[PDB]
Amino acid sequence: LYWDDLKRKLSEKLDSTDFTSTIKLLNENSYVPREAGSQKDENLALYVENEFREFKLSKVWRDQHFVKIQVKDSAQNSVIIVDKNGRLVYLVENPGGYVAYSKAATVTGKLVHANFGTKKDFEDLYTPVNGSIVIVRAGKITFAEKVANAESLNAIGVLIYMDQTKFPIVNAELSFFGHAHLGTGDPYTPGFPSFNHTQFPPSRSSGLPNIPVQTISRAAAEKLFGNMEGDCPSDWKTDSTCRMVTSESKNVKLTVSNVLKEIKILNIFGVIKGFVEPDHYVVVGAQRDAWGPGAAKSGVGTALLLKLAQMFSDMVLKDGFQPSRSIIFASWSAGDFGSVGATEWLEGYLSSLHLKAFTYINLDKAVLGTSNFKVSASPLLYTLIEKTMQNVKHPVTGQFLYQDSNWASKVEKLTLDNAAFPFLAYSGIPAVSFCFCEDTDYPYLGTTMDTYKELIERIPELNKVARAAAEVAGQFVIKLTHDVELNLDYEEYNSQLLSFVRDLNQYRADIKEMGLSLQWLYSARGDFFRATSRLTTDFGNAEKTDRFVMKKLNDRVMRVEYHFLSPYVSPKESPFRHVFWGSGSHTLPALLENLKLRKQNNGAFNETLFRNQLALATWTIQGAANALSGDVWDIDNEF
Template identity: 55%
Template sequence: MDTARSTIYNLFRGEPSTYTRFSLAQHMEGDNSQVEMKLSNSEMDDEVGNSMGGHRDPRIMKPKRSPKSICFMIVCTLLIFLIGFLIGYLSYRGRMPTKEQSCSNADSVSCGTTEELLSEDDSDTTLEAARPVLEWKQLKELLKDRFLVSSFESRIRTFSTNHEAGSEGDQSLALTVYNEFKHFGLGSVWNDEHYVKLQSLGSTPNRVTFLGSGTTEVIEVPKGYLAYSAAGQATGKLVYANYGREEDFKKLTSLKIGVNGSVVIVRGGKISFATKVANAQKVKAAAVLIYLDPADYNMPQDTDVFGHVHLGTGDPYTPGFPSFNHTQFPPAQSSGLPSIPAQTIKTSSARRLMSKMTGQSAPSEWKGTLSPPYNLGNDDNVQVKVEVNNEVAEKMILNVFGVIKGLIDPDHYVVIGAQRDSWGPGVAKSAVGTSLLMEMAKALSDLVVKDGYKPRRSIIFASWSAGDFGSIGATEWLEGYLSMLHLKAFAYINLDAAVLGSQTFKASASPMLYTLLGNTLKEVSSPLDSSKTLYQKLGAESWEKQTIVPMAMDDASYAFQAFSGIPSVSFRFTNDGVYPYFGTTEDNWNNLNTRTGNRVDDIARAAANVAGQMVLRLTHDHQLSLDIDRYNGELYSSVFKINRFAKQLKKAGLSIKWLSSARGDFDRATETLKNDILNSDLNDAEMCRIINERIMRVEYHFLSPYVSPKDTPFRHIFYGSGPHTLKSLLENLSLLNSNTSDLDMDVLRNQLALATWTIQGAANALSGDIWDIDNEF
């Protein structure tokens, strides 16, 4: 107490002072922060006195300080502090631009755009800076409200014009999309040019001619055509082969109907045009004619039909690499191009041809509803000549992009895309998807600018061209950025053909997106019964079984999934059976409106909500909404099927224990990652990014690293095509139970080994750092 009193007394008496230092705090590096404090002479004297045994010199007299001088010192101190504060404040305000200055300097369409809000210079890279100010419930309701004021019908009517890829109409529509993206205030808007080879009708028309019993009759000079058919002429006996599936050709063989050198006529449906032609080529058919049977397609019988027969995606003359200049590479072509002519014909022309056919009656399940009897043909007196004169030309196509940049991981993005081109009006094929894309870009941009949403990751909107020719625009973009997209794009949402009807909901997706899709269906109301969600309408227990269907190669999502290893999803509101109007002039507003019960707007709004909520979830949550557990089920199912051949493999000196071990490692890796997530602070930006990048690697590492993307572009072992897939491995294993002479054991051994190491590689990638991987089998 005496010391305290002395200190206070001396402070106000104002004795002469000296300096010393003491530590206030420690820096993280271990250095001590120092602050200088004045100690009174009395304290110093005490220290000196104490050091000398406590004796003081009585002759030292301490000067006194008056109360007036003390008050003066306090007032001066306060005045200096106030002046310093004002100078600092005015200096800060001087550096801050006014709202008017911000608007005048902005390079955007209007003040307060997404570009300004998500500027890289002003953004903070911490999670706290980008923490959404909106709760999830608020966010989804705001998005729903945005779509309520959208006029999907008006947009669909605007975009439903003939605009074949590479045409002036396509370029004009690309400009419209570009300008609208700019008007919405997206952060960046750009075009991506590709010079691709497209095939169309030539100067000499295609022709189908009947030859028989000394007569010649031109059946049709079609206006429709099949892009990428082989050009030339072929003549042969006419044979009916149902849908042109592999099992259909096997049935013909069992019925002793020869196909070699014949012209095969098949009906559309069940499988793609390209697959029908590929199957016919395998059995050495000379040419293929495709028609639409009234049993499957209810439309005018004089309707022309367009399609393509490239068994692949992208420009078939630059397989595996982007189409920017064909002259820079030696001539090449996709192995998926057919070597035989193929042509579509009208239903009325098919009736005329089939009425002339004789021979065995077709199996009952092969018969459609054409008036003549369905005979298999193979009669020398009933021959057909097919002439295809399609021409290939190089054309420039434009993909158009816009982006809303994320605040935490702007280099991680979800891509939303839709095909823009169409051979005919293309209402369901392209106009619906493009309309959804535009309304989503507008709604999500408004959500950021006007409602304060702060996405953690970026959102890219993509308008593709040449989708009608086999997802060329999308695939060329993927090929052009193959080395980086798997590190940045974590999901693709396809909007093509999202509205085909109203009765049910179907989807094709990566297993990693099943959970996200299911959770989204729980929150989106059915367009036909707002009292129920889509999840309830489908049935809570069996929604996956009712909803999930295989992803077809002509789906734009397929290239993202099987070529680039990016989790992808396509979905559609539809009716039972196929949508009959694709590739025809009947794909128009009236027919789509009829199929939806005059509720196109309502169905489109529901589709926008499904896609929009998936996008928000993928950009809102700390952890990516990708379910790593789902591939455990896929792997278990595949290994279980392979295990049925364990005894046969053992006899051949092979074992599946290494494959089973790799599957087990993947299972353990997913469990480790889940535990890491539970034990991590996802509010830590760096930790959250590390976790998400491990999740992002899963799909990509199911692409086989042992095959060339040029020769075998669809490298995914689950969903790709080629000898590296688990499906191909199972097909070879099945030969162990039949005729082993057809089985090359070296090929089987190689398939088993490479499948094992692809799965092991996926497990290693998911495990994290190299020192976290247990390499003991």
């Protein structure tokens, strides 16, 4: 069949699927407080597993894992205002929720208020946090980062609250759940999978806080500010009530007693074997666990995952759809702790997944509103996101998703808190991640209020919306399979690479003071450009009939993304090796970020570090080229 056919079919199928029901079903007490590794968790897990079986799809299995999660100890965690001795006022509060992987300790001192988790940026404010507890708003960044920065400035203890402006929740006595791990997955099995506790049981600090972090209710925040002299700025796009520093007269004490708890995570798979490249998959995932009932955090996703798997299987058996490449749906678990489920899976194919999975879609938090349509992905999926937003019509507005007034659409970078991030920054798999987002992030998100009710009370046509999300997700799959040519934008990296070279040339001056020639970089950038130009040519000259010549090409395409992961850094040390989207000194952005410091004439600039950064970052790109063809044995022997 042809695209129109698949597009049309997939639509009517989407026209007759109740997503709202399943989003509700995944709310019955049968599986409501489906915490990570809980019974409910395991309940829904088997539900999905069976549903897949019922869907009559091909092979479907389970993925067991034992990771260390952190939970609230029997001893109560609390915040209390107290002078250089005893609590005068009252125990601010005994927080109802907590920040996982938080340093298990208790300390007291001054209490500064660095708007939006310091943002790392905001830390450049007047009052110093040099040895004092800090308050921050839940927002622009992730707790992990908020805390990380706080501690990088030598602070201790961090409180996170949901202000009124950012979080318009009527109830101010509401508490939410946190993360705190500056990474992805179990924080003791970096790059390699985990085992028992009995075996390989290190404690922590392997990329974990080392500073107590506690989530606080707005109400509690109110009271804290009540005992603070300083006055909150207008710079902070907030609203009155907060201070900046506690009234000297007295300080505050934070006490968090949390304990590690080995649980058994259960990932559930299920594929749909392809017909020509049966061994090249399109991983479609969806977080299944959640702290509260997580109708949004986990409902909509799993809801889509199921309904979406139900369709393709059907299409394959009844409608004649013959996906040239297999599809593999996966419902991860222990996701509230950093995609621990999906990550440790990847951890499992540390150097082969890219040979198998060529793209990872992600349905998490797919429906959160009806205004915007945020989209984050690897440039390799740029044109797919585009052309698809040109085929899918907004659920509310009768118009298409794509803003016809531009030629350059907006695509966001994947964040440390998105299961898709690991797939791309660690496993080198290109990944997309859409969201029918809103200017303001869903409030009830990390709290017990993520109910199917308060959701649909806030998004009336949730069905139509989820449908759309299920449609863009569907087309991605049809598209990434329908045709024999693996359609990934390996060109977009030329641009991505040129942009770097450009930004780097703004320091040609600094580059000159240092003996650096910066010539080898251009060569790489070019040696790579050709590589793509050949591939982009060889394709055109090859016939969509020679299963062999095509397979040889598609494989080259399939290498592109993975090969941009620094082959000079160990996964065990720095898991996000992707020079473009990773995190670490190997990061391309990180290079400029160090060089910028050169001008500051201070010591902030580590020259030896740069020298290497450039040196390697060059050979990384270079290699990416020699790997992406050049007909092998690239013959630019001159230079």
